[PDB]
Amino acid sequence: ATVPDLESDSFHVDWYSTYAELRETAPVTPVRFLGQDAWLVTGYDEAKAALSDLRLSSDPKKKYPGVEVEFPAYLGFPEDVRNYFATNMGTSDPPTHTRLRKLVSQEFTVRRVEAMRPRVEQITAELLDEVGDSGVVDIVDRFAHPLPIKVICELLGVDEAARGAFGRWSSEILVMDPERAEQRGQAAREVVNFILDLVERRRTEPGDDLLSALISVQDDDDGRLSADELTSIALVLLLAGFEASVSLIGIGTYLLLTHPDQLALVRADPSALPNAVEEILRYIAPPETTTRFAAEEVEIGGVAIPQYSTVLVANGAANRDPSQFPDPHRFDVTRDTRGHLSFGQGIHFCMGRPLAKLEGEVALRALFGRFPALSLGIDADDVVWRRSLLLRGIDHLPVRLDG
Template sequence: MDRPVQATDPSSTERPSLRELATDPLITRDYEARPALVYESLRARHGAVAPVDLLGVPVWLALGYAEVLEVMQNRDRVWSKRLDAWRDYAEGRVPRDWPLLPALEVDHVVFQEGRRLEELRGAYHAALRPFQDPASPQARELRAATARYADELIDVMTEGSGGSGFADLSAQYARPLPLMVVDRLLGFANGAGDEVLMDMWRVLDAGPDSGPALERLLAALAELAAAKMARPGDDFPSHMLAARPEFTVDELSRELMMLVGVAGDFPGVLINNTVVEVINGGAGVRDSLSAGLIRETVNRVAMASPPMANLTMRCPSTDVRLGGRLIRAGEPVMLSVAAAHADPAFTGGAGLDRADRVYQTRAHLAWGAGPHHCLGVELATMIVETAIDRLFARFGALSLTLPPDQLPWRSSPLMRGLRSLPVRYELAPRPAQPVPSPAPQPVFEPEPDAPRPEQPRSALWRFLRGLRRGAR
């Protein structure tokens, strides 16, 4: 590993800074259509670390697997995700209207370091444990609820179709399912999470109404945080408070927003990418799902098509060498997981679509590594596995209505996901159900506070039924 180079090293004053280098724009039409070709072109011209223009701001883009992993692991403790570690930002050279700035200025766990990071990650670990430990009743209930939500979405998608039809699996299944799970995790009462789900979509899509949606989202999460402080329950916010009682309403609401944004979007992108992999892979890949290899399939897709293609920037506290480049203190380095997974030094020159490369999927970086490694891996994986299991159990046949290279992608500097996933489907025959015996009449009335079945989500269901009508 290259060791840090002190600012007094003569080479640090002789070499130009990032702002002085010529940079090529990263986000172009070529990037939207075939980002892998853009990464390889940058690697051929610049090596493992390339200077690029990110929507008008110069950044270093780490393309090499070893370099990305080195920064993630941060063994020398020189790399910081704190926004104030970015020299151009601290000195006012980043335009206030830079599109990525609002997301980077939210002060939550993703952008913390040191003791603060350890404290917040400790709270997350404790709060997620009941919902990720397969032996816990909360985790079993959450998995069962996820399967039930998946079946409900499929029922709405196929209602009145006569057993076959067309659908957009992204809008009608892959995107709403994780948000429904997050809604349950947050513990919203009486379906109040409906509008939060819809506003989260608006924020993630960064459309013209994303600003007002963000304000409503933060207000709703602050109200939820205050409610859980007053009356905790068996949900994620309450477990966070139990682990770290000193949370303020504002602090907790920011952490809840991070959970909604990451857990609500990342699994949906991975569901879409896995569906495409299974459809394109033919009968062999689908048979592997029946053989219980869903997790291996999901892992391989996460390596070949990571949902978060590029990660938010890290800045070194001192001059360092990375991939043969001198990175000056305070210069931003964006880590490209997608490029790292395609690095010939990692793949050995073989393509990522090679089935015999499954053994390497556990070395992928889609979940991060080091101090910022994703704490919700099991939660996200459960959502994706359950979604894939229910989808291919319910549909006897699924086929794309567009060639794979014509599928529309959501272009983003960070995420790489489908905008829509148009398919033609045929429902699998339902197994015959035994005729139930007449139920005995109850000898007592249930108590007024007895648990009731979950009520349909009005706003979300109206939206999804509207999509179904529009698809006809």
């Protein structure tokens, strides 16, 4: 037959049309990606079922007989650094996942996030102060990007002389291009080194930050985080703590700008903003694809996925399933967004949801309330989308502030 290769332009040029075509044909279809055979789940029910099925592991460190487990997101990562990226809750299965998440939840709380609101609002104001009030500016470089980074650095205790650097590393890690596999693996080692230093200096000079707190956190029945776990969790909190938020702000800005009717709605009714954020995530999900490994044979949507298969749950395609979201291709800030899979589903549900919504709301509100004449500086069709199934986004978005 003819198997699709996720590396083709069909998955990067009007891709939601390609997911649509695949879905109606087969909601669970075999594909080729990065040289391996995998299974792409495009249907809503099938995707939701797969995330809820624990036979589909999240752990890339598990060893099986005559099997070489290879998650495409670790393309080019040496084993030592791979292990540093994969010893946290998102790369663990129960009961390991259970205690890891339990320990972290004790400190990464809603109270701590809420206590950050005035700071987030303060940082937003400042960045907007610096862009001016006329002409064209790169809203990503000048706003969408710095904001989440400054917020996460304060939450984690990352000081001035450290920030920015990781910015360039993370960019490399976001794309999975076999040609640049060694550069990708190189950037990965850089972040691992940076984190090792961060953690060490934090053990020596403790503060009020989340990292310090996770260092002394302990539970009577679950004990505490080991050095490796602490190091890996710190690493993922830093990276996952800002990247997806950059995508939310930037994609969100592009969408409101391109949907005047929807933007006006938000301007008129600020209470319609929280749901606009949820509709932004549903419309174009940043984590377009999440990976799972079939430890056992699993039947999804009538299809029997062979044991030891790599399954790619297309969260983004699922959010566009007609049977779940009527007229899914219509960006509507007023629609019911309940059930979208952008924050996950099941035991690995997004822990940072509270912070992500806070950032998206505060940021978009400020941006648009500050520049009532804001518009795109390029034709909508010219916007360049990040070519990644791992974390979709816009790296350059020129806007005109005054009009």
